[PDB]
Amino acid sequence: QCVNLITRTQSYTNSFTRGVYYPDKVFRSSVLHSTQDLFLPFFSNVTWFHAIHVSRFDNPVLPFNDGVYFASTEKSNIIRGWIFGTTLDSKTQSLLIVNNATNVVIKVCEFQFCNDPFLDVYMESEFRVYSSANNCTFEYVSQPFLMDKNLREFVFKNIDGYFKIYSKHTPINLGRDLPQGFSALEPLVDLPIGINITRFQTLLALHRSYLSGWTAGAAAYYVGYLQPRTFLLKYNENGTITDAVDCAL
Ligand SMILES: *[C@@H]1O[C@H](CO)[C@@H](O[C@@H]2O[C@H](CO)[C@@H](O)[C@H](O)[C@H]2NC(C)=O)[C@H](O)[C@H]1NC(C)=O
Ligand SMILES: *[C@@H]1O[C@H](CO)[C@@H](O)[C@H](O)[C@H]1NC(C)=O
Ligand SMILES: *[C@@H]1O[C@H](CO)[C@@H](O)[C@H](O)[C@H]1NC(C)=O
Ligand SMILES: *[C@@H]1O[C@H](CO)[C@@H](O)[C@H](O)[C@H]1NC(C)=O
Ligand SMILES: *[C@@H]1O[C@H](CO)[C@@H](O)[C@H](O)[C@H]1NC(C)=O
């Protein structure tokens, strides 16, 4: 039941100083700590995607590289998770992250993914996301991380068997979607996945119209790519990363 419904246009914007995360689970207070890790570089070129379904395949699969910075200004219900893998078919393993109103399901199986995968609400059905899922080796259900104008930031890394997800929710006063300043991303989950990830894709939710089988919709999200970079992070009195300098400039 794979159907091509999403067309996507893309523009390019500046990351400013977004994308800093806590590199470890160690409390540091009132110090300057220099760490070398996969960070999103300051003032880097970040791709802004507008995905439109109006009521052919024009929604290609993005590369993953060394890790992905994801951002969205959209509401919590439109973007509902992500797809990670290499071939995205039944011959290789894949990771599916699906959020809904009550919880989040993170599940690694052998999914036969559709060319334009989307979660459709009517209750929610995943029959348009994939046609089959066999030999499934990981499942993890927990409290959701897309909850409620509001900028939502995620960092995905795939390092030595662990899929690390970092997140942050920042209330941005109505204006430019990518704001100035710092908002460090707290460690959200470390998943013992152990799979090869070279490509990734965003999952959107589409509503049936009941009036053009699906309601017309748009979703805007920012994707940037992490690079091995040395950062100097400032930890303040309460342990929060309030500032950083990227050592290339
Ligand atoms: C949101 O996702 C959760 C996780 O899958 C759903 O809860 C499960 O629903 C199935 C019914 O197909 C039950 O068999 C499971 O026992 C439920 N698990 C848990 C942990 O509750 C939930 O139904 C989904 N909600 C919506 C609106 O789609
Ligand atoms: C971002 O990349 C595009 C294409 O690679 C390029 O045209 C544009 O100038 C870049 N923007 C910046 C700020 O480097
Ligand atoms: C994968 O699934 C197929 C059929 O679903 C089965 O024949 C095969 O043995 C499975 N392989 C593993 C490693 O589970
Ligand atoms: C990961 O997948 C890519 C693309 O299919 C492949 O070139 C690479 O060798 C794979 N790496 C491992 C460790 O399987
Ligand atoms: C840290 O926590 C204290 C405790 O009340 C608070 O007064 C202060 O505003 C917080 N922030 C900083 C930057 O010290």
Swiss-Prot record:
State what changing residue 116 to Y does: In strain: Gamma/P.1
Q: What is the effect of changing residue 152 to S?
A: In strain: Gamma/P.1
| Cystines in this chain | 2-114, 109-136
Query: Region annotation Disordered: residue ranges?
Result: 120-134, 208-218
Q: Which residues form the BetaCoV S1-NTD domain?
A: 1-249
Source taxon at top rank:
Viruses
Q: What is the effect of changing residue 124 to K?
A: In strain: Kappa/B.1.617.1
- Sugar-bearing residue positions: 4, 45, 100, 135, 196, 238
- Tell me the segments the record calls region Putative superantigen: 236-249
Q: What is the effect of changing residue 152 to K?
A: Partial loss of biliverdin affinity
* Effect the entry attributes to changing residue 36 to H: In strain: Omicron/EG.5.1
Q: What is the effect of changing residue 80 to I?
A: In strain: A23.1
- Impact noted for substituting residue 213 to S: In strain: Omicron/BA.2.75
Q: Quote the annotated effect of residue 5 to F.
A: In strain: Beta/B.1.351, Gamma/P.1, 19B/501Y
Effect of changing residue 73 to I: reported as:
In strain: Iota/B.1.526, Mu/B.1.621, B.1.1.318, Omicron/BA.1
Q: How does it assemble?
A: Binds to host ACE2. RBD also interacts with the N-linked glycan on 'Asn-90' of ACE2. Cleavage of S generates a polybasic C-terminal sequence on S1 that binds to host Neuropilin-1 (NRP1) and Neuropilin-2 (NRP2) receptors. Interacts with host integrin alpha-5/beta-1 (ITGA5:ITGB1) and with ACE2 in complex with integrin alpha-5/beta-1 (ITGA5:ITGB1). May interact via cytoplasmic c-terminus with M protein. May interact (via N-terminus) with host bilirubin and biliverdin, thereby preventing antibody binding to the SARS-CoV-2 spike NTD via an allosteric mechanism.
Task of the protein = Attaches the virion to the cell membrane by interacting with host receptor, initiating the infection. The major receptor is host ACE2. When S2/S2' has been cleaved, binding to the receptor triggers direct fusion at the cell membrane. When S2/S2' has not been cleaved, binding to the receptor results in internalization of the virus by endocytosis using host TFRC and GRM2 and leading to fusion of the virion membrane with the host endosomal membrane. Alternatively, may use NRP1/NRP2 and integrin as entry receptors.
- The protein depicted here goes by the name Spike protein S1
From which residue to which, out of the full length, is covered? 14 to 293 of 1273
